[PDB]
From a paper:
One such nuclease, [name] (Gbs0661) from [name] (henceforth referred to as GBS_[name]), has been shown to degrade NETs and to improve infection persistence in the host. GBS_[name] is thought to be a sequence-nonspecific DNA/RNA nuclease with endonucleolytic and exonucleolytic activity. Although this family of nucleases share a common ββα metal-finger catalytic core and reaction mechanism, their global structures, localization and regulatory mechanisms can vary widely. As a starting point for such development, we have determined high-resolution X-ray crystal structures of GBS_[name] with and without bound magnesium ion and compared them with those of other ββα metal-finger nucleases.
GBS_[name] was also crystallized in space group P63 in the presence of a divalent Mg2+ ion and a putative substrate DNA, although there was no visible electron density for the DNA. Asn179 is the only residue to directly interact with the metal. An intricate network of putative hydrogen-bonding interactions links the metal in the active center through Asn179 to the distally located Gln180 and His142, using Asp145 as the intermediary. The most significant difference is observed in the ordering of the coil between β-strands 4 and 5 of molecules A and B in the P63 crystal form. This is the first reported structure of a Streptococcus sp. nuclease in which this loop is ordered. Residues Arg116–Asp118 along this loop form a short α-helix (henceforth referred to as α-helix S), although there are no such indications of helical propensity in Arg116–Asp118 in the P1 crystal form. Given that this coil is entirely disordered in the P1 crystal form and is incomplete in molecules C and D of the P63 crystal form, we hypothesize that it is highly mobile in the absence of a DNA substrate. Since residues along this loop in EndA (Arg127/Lys128) have been shown to strongly influence DNA binding and these residues appear to be conserved in GBS_[name] (Arg116/Arg117), this region might also act as a substrate-binding loop in this enzyme. Since Asn179 is the only protein side chain directly chelating the hydrated divalent Mg2+ ion in the active site, these results provide confirmation that the plasmid conversion and SRED assays are performing as expected.
Author numbering: 43 to 261
The structure:
């Protein structure tokens, strides 16, 4: 519905330009699932968050391997501000299996880079966390994919001792919006076996969200 809506595809185009895209398995494959990311042997593992000129979390880059892979539970390694809330955060109970509307959506996953020293890997890192639907955050449904599905592919590659160049960009309709309408994920392993370039719609079937405010209107 919203995902395939014309208003959505227009925003996507505004954000990615003349790049081809194709709605498949609940997400948009961009550039025929190919990214320009190059995984060079000579880049050390790292994570870098940015914010845009509107103080919103922007493009995140990383090189992922076993030296920054985080195998421990969050509660053992992080002390997040329990009170902190990302931009446009408006939580509501939902009539679906998630039971709630939005999650704290990490750009770069805790488990992938949480052992990079000096980088805040908690849910309260204000440069790495946005307001994200529970569906687009959590979904591992191969036929209705969320960001987790793609993070899992990356994690599995790392756990096979592959080095993965990784980029996560929140996409905004404009300068004003507090919340991204989609999450752009790109990855490429050194041996090239893993590669993708997708946009995960920041949506959930049970409702619609105003990306300007992050206010949720249930169905
Ligand atoms: Cl091994
Ligand atoms: Cl859903
Ligand atoms: Mg997540």
């Amino acid at each position: 519905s919203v995902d395939t809506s014309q208003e959505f595809q227009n925003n996507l185009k505004n954000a990615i330009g003349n790049l081809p895209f194709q709605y498949v398995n609940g997400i948009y494959e961009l550039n025929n699932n190919q990214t320009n990311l190059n995984a060079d042997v000579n880049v050390k593992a790292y994570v870098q968050n940015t914010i845009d000129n509107q103080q919103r979390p922007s493009t995140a880059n990383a090189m992922l391997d076993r030296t920054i892979r985080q195998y421990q539970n969050r509660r053992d390694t992080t002390l997040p501000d329990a009170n902190w809330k990302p931009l446009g955060w408006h939580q509501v109970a939902t009539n679906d299996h998630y039971g709630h509307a939005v999650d704290k959506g990490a750009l770069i996953a805790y488990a992938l880079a949480g052992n990079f020293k000096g980088w805040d890997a908690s849910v309260s890192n204000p440069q790495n966390v946005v307001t994200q639907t529970a569906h687009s955050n959590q979904s591992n449904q191969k036929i209705n994919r969320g960001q987790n599905y793609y993070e899992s592919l990356v994690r599995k590659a790392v756990d096979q001792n592959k080095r993965v160049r990784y980029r996560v960009t929140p996409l905004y309709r404009n300068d004003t919006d507090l919340v991204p309408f989609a999450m752009h994920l790109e990855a490429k392993s050194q041996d090239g076996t893993l590669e993708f370039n997708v946009a995960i719609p920041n949506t959930q079937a049970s409702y619609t969200m105003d990306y300007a405010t992050g206010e949720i209107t249930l169905n």
